[PDB]
Point group: C3
Chain length 224, copies 3
């Protein structure tokens, strides 16, 4: 009956709870970046735009690769407003209280695990969406699933440029972080499953690769 459990796991509604966890973890990472708090004070619109890149950079990149509107996902008003509320609470909540609650390690590890549920679903969705437009476009499927999983990391040089920072000596392709490299392995697996060369159901692959990402990220977050 594992396939019955895997089907329920792979079809949980990500909105709003799992998307909120994705936004919280991503905007927390933004606040850790150098000068981010000062930027929220002096350039609040640019700070909000930076948070939108961290929350929706996966869709911006995937739409750019497929020749669609790069801000197509911003028509989802409820998601944009939810990410905006997360950005406001993390940077401007009185007593910094919202930051204190979501940074509490037991709470943070749960949000970290929930973000990985969202990331794997976005990888698989990118492969399936590219396949719909290119039935045999294996390289387009792998590219779309990769940027859906890596997100803002692949545009880090220009997220820095928006913040007034320029560090051209490195980038996430020249030196992949773990989530970028893991998203590359994930998009190859989901493409192979789309090819019907990997004999596994799409629900089981989602379940087992999500558990791999959850264990890795929770372990990495709890260590440091």
């Amino acid at each position: 009956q594992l396939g019955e459990l895997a089907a329920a796991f792979a079809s949980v509604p990500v909105f709003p709870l799992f998307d909120a966890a994705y936004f919280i973890v991503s905007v927390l990472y933004l606040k850790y970046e150098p000068g981010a708090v000062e930027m929220s004070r002096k350039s609040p619109f640019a700070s909000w735009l930076c948070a939108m890149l961290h929350c929706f950079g996966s869709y911006i990149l995937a739409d750019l690769l497929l020749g669609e509107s790069p801000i197509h996902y911003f028509s989802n008003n409820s998601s944009v407003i939810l990410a905006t509320a997360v950005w406001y609470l993390i940077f401007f909540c009185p007593m910094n209280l919202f930051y204190k609650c979501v940074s509490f390690l037991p709470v943070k590890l749960i949000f970290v695990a929930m973000k990985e549920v969202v990331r794997v679903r976005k990888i698989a969705a990118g492969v399936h969406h590219a396949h719909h437009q290119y039935h045999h476009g294996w390289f387009i499927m792998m590219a779309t699933g990769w940027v859906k999983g890596s997100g803002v990391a692949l545009m880090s040089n220009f997220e820095q440029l928006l913040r007034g920072v320029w560090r051209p000596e490195t980038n996430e392709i020249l030196h992949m972080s773990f989530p970028t490299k893991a998203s590359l392995y994930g998009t190859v697996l989901f493409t192979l499953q789309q090819t019907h060369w990997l004999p596994v159901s799409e629900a089981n692959l989602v379940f087992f690769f999500t558990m791999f990402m959850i264990v890795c990220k929770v372990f990495m977050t709890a260590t440091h």
Copy 2:
């Protein structure tokens, strides 16, 4: 009968006279930039391309945001040729005579006011065009109207790169100039009017916001 006057004001044909004023003011600003005259001598094609960015950057950015051809507007041959003639006269007219005439302060203030007529129309057109593709895409409407009004300013980091200049410490989002910030207020107003939450006719909003931009820009130009 103000609405009858506002309807005539909001429907004046911008081509060719008001577009010419837009091109003249924008290419004048290009000639003020460092190394622009030297660039016209040594790299005339790059200088012409820079002037096309200043004249049509609003359409390039709006088409990029909506997933359309970024050079779609360059199919308008008469507009491209008119902007090309303006670029040639400003940089290469014998005796620098065309520059001397359009820089004469009474003449320049008139062209500055006429450019603001074009800018407000482009903001409203961007909101209406985005609304046609996304009936409830408020964030897409505001983004499209903003870049239609700000124009080349939002791509200033890469207009500089074309000229061989790189200044990453600042950008027009991190530090908005007045026209960029005013275009942001304008696109919010025209979006609200599109929402039917701002109880005002589209013609009256065009008239009153254009007069606001005309008074501000004419005052700013005459002061410095």
Copy 3:
């Protein structure tokens, strides 16, 4: 009977032999770039992506200009695999044997001539493709044919960024190399032929402009 010879010349199948020559010459140029060999060792995925830019940058740029998927051409699996095999053999063949064979000057000059056959065909195809979407879009036709011929050179600032290099003081528009400038003359000629203002058959223009590019590039390669 020259038109009968020109028709056969202009319709030779570029895949796979002429495309292979295009890939070999382009990836050879990549290996000449500073730090390219070290990059293939330490960042092999970024090295492979760099080679894809050199092999398919013409299609990436043309699709970007026309608002299509910038990786649309990567649905051609056989072409991507052939370019991938060329990249692997040039950087990783035991004894560096493949590099030694294709760098042998008589063999290299033949591949250089065959690449020019591909470049002229891509210029003409870009003009014809833009004309199909814009019957009177002369500036869109010239832009599309130019990037189809220049290829990765027009994105050199960002091919360098992928390699961790940033040299903003120059670019291929501000200072055109010979292939970039020759592709600009070529796209004007093919646009004029599309206008029916240049009284010459498309096959004869392909033949005579290819011979011009072959003689120039073979002479330039044999000199240095």
